[model samples]
Target: QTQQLHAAMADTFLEHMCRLDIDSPPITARNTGIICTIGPASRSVETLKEMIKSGMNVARLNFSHGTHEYHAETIKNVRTATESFASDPILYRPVAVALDTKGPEIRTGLIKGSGTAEVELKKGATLKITLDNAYMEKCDENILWLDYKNICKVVEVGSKIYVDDGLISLQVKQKGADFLVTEVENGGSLGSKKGVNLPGAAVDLPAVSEKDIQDLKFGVEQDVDMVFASFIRKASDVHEVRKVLGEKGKNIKIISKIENHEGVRRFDEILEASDGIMVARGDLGIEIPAEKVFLAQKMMIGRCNRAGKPVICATQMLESMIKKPRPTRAEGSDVANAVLDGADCIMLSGETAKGDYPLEAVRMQNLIAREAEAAIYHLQLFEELRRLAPITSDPTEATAVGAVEASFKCCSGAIIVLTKSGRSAHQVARYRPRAPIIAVTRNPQTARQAHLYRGIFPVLCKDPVQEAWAEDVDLRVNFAMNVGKARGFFKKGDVVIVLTGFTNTMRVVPVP
Candidate 1:
């Protein structure tokens, strides 16, 4: 076993390392996708275009703060930015737009009527948290208002309350009919309407709130590519959102965000229900021990890989990039590990949403992903995943496996798939080919959705549909080859593995 492992390692290192010269290496297109949240710092059309050029595959609209009008404008800007990049009509780069819903949450009320005020709380000072309607309008340092009405009923003496993402802490001293008297254990500036976390509390909050329902409807109206459903705990939560999506939005991918401990416990059921998953580590780190969050991250990502579903590792991935041009060494390693962990997409929250260096952040992630992808032991990974998969009698599946095997053995520069449903390309991507998979599809939606898969470069074919089946296939393949060459992945004299027609056939051709 050790000999086999060493052989695989030597082969992998020799192949990839030989390509690296002392000088500048060839431009490598990043296979792992980048998802950037659009907010105040990077919402303009020009800024969006720069971010895309810097390497952003998906744009996320966070519904927690913005209204539908705000998001609609952002969506329009995103499309405009995508359209502006296509100097040639045939090579349209499709960037997906996602809606991140504000699921059921508990938050503090506004500090005074203006809702812009902040108060400093000293350690050991007594604080009164009230659910009374009066305090909701004018919460001060001494008395604060919680939106959750059952806070008093759900807690006992000595129960800890964390506010503003655990920056401030309070221990429940006593409970009354509608209030709780507590002593602030951690002192900090308490702002208006910050998030509240209650550890080990048996709270009964609905999975999908009425506001979330409206937001889902708005998302459907906006025709978003996916829904980042937040606070998803159980399978039924996904089902409830699906019901809201109904007939029109049925095709929209639901990427369940696993945030809390319950979501982690019921992860399998949730994964089976949703189209994909997002490791929302901000809230997840709070609900569980921060130290153990790494285990959850690896577990969820591994499971998604085995199931062949796209998984996103998100939240503060490049947090310091919000202020600085470069990331911390640890953040760089964090991103590289996420890419190495088989995450299909690495997400940027504040780094691109409200960061001063949004473009720099995307560029940094792109650089890290390229390096990480190169470091992956592709032969070993491909062999392991191939062995894990059971025998399949499906012809398309067989063709995909054969094509991947050929690519790895022959060291093909790129894998070109002429797909109608984008299924053939997806199948090839599941095997994690070292070469990029150029997916040429006529359907715009298919092209956009294909971004979720690792190593898939979707090219939208805008040529008119013709009755000449063989001629059309040839044209698509030639077009994809040109695309690959232009993008610098497939060069002249490079061997290309081309699979065609629901992938009934595979051909090896030299690039012109």
Candidate 2:
């Protein structure tokens, strides 16, 4: 029986799945977008093409570790590979390239010892700090050594500094000659060049370091799709990078990476201020509790969806795949849940970029997303969820319910939804209208997310692009007619439902 149901769902009757010739290929679906990082697993032009074939919509270049020459090679290879495989001319245009910057993260200086050893700091340890050469070792004495010139200036008494995923936490107690006593809240094994997280302590650092500036120049020269700003605490953090890029920055999208305590608290403001938000989970996990990370992910995605900005759930989505051929069941579920929660894209860190099973990991991710979409409850849950938290200020929710009610009143060919952020589209999708949803979007990210919604046929248009054709009523009617004819949503002379507003910025429009 379950097999029968699955088969039925796979057919056109299910609305979600539309059959296409696997051998000949079909028009690529527009809404679903994937961002895969470049790593050892997917470094070659051939492997990159295979991953895209599996389901990668976006390629990300992490600027944290690689040099300009290496990334340039990757970018050129990705473009060449995409052009070779893309069936249509539209896909030949460069696939979205996102450049991720490594921002003001603190790291311990190199250690000289057996690679792995426990560093125990006694209850009251005076840690001498300097940028000059120094070493850290386990000792019962109250004095410790650090290699940072501005450590004392940045860290005052009672400030907390965490190392190695908060395994080793140190609190400043007092200052002394070339040293400060710190009380260790927790102690664990320390390694050379491990990262440090200073939560709530404002470290004096430039928003874009000398290294990041060089990378920004390279990104512009290479014509990447977007620039991902790391550790974005405020809107100014985004503006700083923009200033460096000058006029070219205007064209490039700035994706703010929210990774710290400050970034989480000010997420909404940040969402409004940037083109996109990356829910950077690695450092985020270290800064906040693991459980809260789930809630944070939900809130961030929801807010970005409401704001019409792209939100990417990133970092370690498939970490174990770095060595293993398959993702753990929990990892699979995590990817599914993110899709259900409405993320524009799911990012893989080491899995595809540096993992042993890069191709398999990407294939697994695609399979999980397909399964989740197949099982998703579209309309009823969407309607109920909207009631809990409405996305718009207008009484569009009531209008939408009335429109659905009207659908029962008369035969409606399709339900047209004018959504900028895709929230209105999600709301309409929840109801599972008997008619297909003609979702018109100005935002590419929103258009992409809408592709994941069952029965949604998204049309990406620039704001005011519809204006060039005709007035609102005629524009909506014509668009509905054209899209319906193309997708078999309706035939000629069919009374297709028309919904839209005078401007693309409007959230929802009443059905006529």
What TM-score would every model get versus the actual structure? 0.93, 0.68
| Candidate 2 lDDT over residue span 101-124, tens digit each | 878877666544444454555444
- Cα TM-score of candidate 1: 0.93
- Candidate 1 — what's its lDDT? 0.87
Task: Name the 10 consecutive residues with the lowest summed lDDT in model 2.
Answer: 19-28
lDDT for each candidate structure = 0.87, 0.66
Model 2 Cα shift for residue 213 (angstroms): 2.5
Model 1 agreement with the true structure over 1-512: per-residue lDDT tens digits: 22122233556566645544333332377899999999999999999989988989899999888788899999999999999977784445789999998887789988884547678889999999999888886777799998998888789999999898878989999989999999999799889888898878866888888999998999898888899999999999999999999999998999999999999999999999998999999989888989999999999998998888889999988999998989999999999899988999999989988899999999999998987776676776898889988888899898998999999887798899988778898889988988889898888877888888899998888778779998888888888877788878867899999999747899999998
